[PDB]
Amino acid sequence: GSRARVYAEVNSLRSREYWDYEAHVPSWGNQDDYQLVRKLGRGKYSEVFEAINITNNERVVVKILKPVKKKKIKREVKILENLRGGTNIIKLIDTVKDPVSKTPALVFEYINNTDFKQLYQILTDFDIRFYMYELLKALDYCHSKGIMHRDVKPHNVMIDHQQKKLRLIDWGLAEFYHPAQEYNVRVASRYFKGPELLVDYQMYDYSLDMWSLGCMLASMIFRREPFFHGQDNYDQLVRIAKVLGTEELYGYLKKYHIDLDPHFNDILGQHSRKRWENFIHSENRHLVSPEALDLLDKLLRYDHQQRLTAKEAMEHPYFYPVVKEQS
Numbered sequence: 202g203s204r205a206r207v208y209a210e211v212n213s214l215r216s217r218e219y220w221d222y223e224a225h226v227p228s229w230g231n232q233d234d235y236q237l238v239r240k241l242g243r244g245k246y247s248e249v250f251e252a253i254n255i256t257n258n259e260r261v262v263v264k265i266l267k268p269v270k271k272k273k274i275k276r277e278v279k280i281l282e283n284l285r286g287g288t289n290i291i292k293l294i295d296t297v298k299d300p301v302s303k304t305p306a307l308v309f310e311y312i313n314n315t316d317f318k319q320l321y322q323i324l325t326d327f328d329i330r331f332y333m334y335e336l337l338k339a340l341d342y343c344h345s346k347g348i349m350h351r352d353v354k355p356h357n358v359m360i361d362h363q364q365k366k367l368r369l370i371d372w373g374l375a376e377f378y379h380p381a382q383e384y385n386v387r388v389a390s391r392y393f394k395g396p397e398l399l400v401d402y403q404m405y406d407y408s409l410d411m412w413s414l415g416c417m418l419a420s421m422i423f424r425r426e427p428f429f430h431g432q433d434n435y436d437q438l439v440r441i442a443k444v445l446g447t448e449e450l451y452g453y454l455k456k457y458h459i460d461l462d463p464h465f466n467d468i469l470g471q472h473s474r475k476r477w478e479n480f481i482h483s484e485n486r487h488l489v490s491p492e493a494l495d496l497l498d499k500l501l502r503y504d505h506q507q508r509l510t511a512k513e514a515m516e517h518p519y520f521y522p523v524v525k526e527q528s
């Protein structure tokens with residue numbers, strides 16, 4: 202069966218306590234040190250506030266967890282602790298509880314996030330290379346720590362475009378990679394789901410995140426955001442196949458002995474693989490280069506095992522101008 206080409210055995214080479222999150226016992230500090238200032242948003246399992254630590258005036262973000270999901274809380278906490286100090290991963294400052302109700306919350310460093318819908322229409326060529334390289338550092342780091350993020354998307358990539366700071370947030374879907382483990386395919390947001398998820402292939406790996414980052418790259422260089430805009434999970438695969446091709450999808454399915462839900466037979470149609478240059482027009486031509494297309498072509502592949510790793514992507518000539526500037 203399938204396995205990651207990189208960091209496949211890394212959790213097995215570490216102490217069991219590293220990855221056995223169910224056994225993790227967080228130290229829960231006191232939420233009363235924090236003053237909530239403003240609500241920033243809400244997820245299925247949390248609500249997020251900007252806050253101030255009253256003891257030292259630090260501005261932070263507090264994510265208050267809906268507390269009936271103990272295993273999932275331990276997972277997110279243990280993952281964040283393991284990722285401590287990783288480049289461009291959001292910093293977990295503390296794990297706290299309301300001392301009376303015992304409701305848990307996560308305290309993060311604050312980032313002054315620029316709205317991505319506005320930002321992605323003003324990025325320059327260099328900006329895209331820069332931010333994509335910064336995001337890749339976060340993914341290479343978390344992959345090297347045996348963790349798949351499983352929800353990479355613009356809303357989870359905080360960018361302070363004034364300070365040029367990027368942080369990958371929202372680790373609540375992340376999981377430890379173990380070779381041959383079958384994972385739930387109900388992860389990632391629709392537009393960023395890899396084909397593997399859409400065809401119910403459970404033996405996926407870190408390369409799922411590389412598909413999602415390819416989707417982000419394509420939206421930035423082509424200015425079509427999201428790049429693959431499905432109406433539902435079925436239509437999402439059709440949108441992919443209209444670009445990557447249907448015969449090419451079937452070759453992937455055949456390689457991995459993947460069974461295709463027969464509802465797809467009535468909607469996939471027949472589509473040639475499209476040239477990436479077909480997406481260029483006057484509005485995006487200044488963001489597209491041969492090196493951007495070569496990189497994108499190596500990310501947005503059906504075959505998860507053939508996608509570039511985060512490191513291989515960082516190594517691509519598209520990022521040479523960023524490396525040189527950083528030197």
Ligand SMILES: CC(C)n1c2c(c3c1-c1c(Br)c(Br)c(Br)c(Br)c1C3=O)C(=O)CCC2
Nearest residue numbers: 241242243244249262309310311312314370
């Ligand atoms: C997009 C924004 C409104 N946002 C959301 C979430 C989170 C944020 C957010 C921001 Br912004 C910042 Br800044 C930091 Br730091 C951190 Br941590 C978070 C965070 O965890 C969710 O968890 C789900 C709903 C939306």
Ligand SMILES: [Cl-]
Nearest residue numbers: 376383384385
């Ligand atoms: Cl899972």
Ligand SMILES: [Cl-]
Nearest residue numbers: 428440443444
């Ligand atoms: Cl298209």
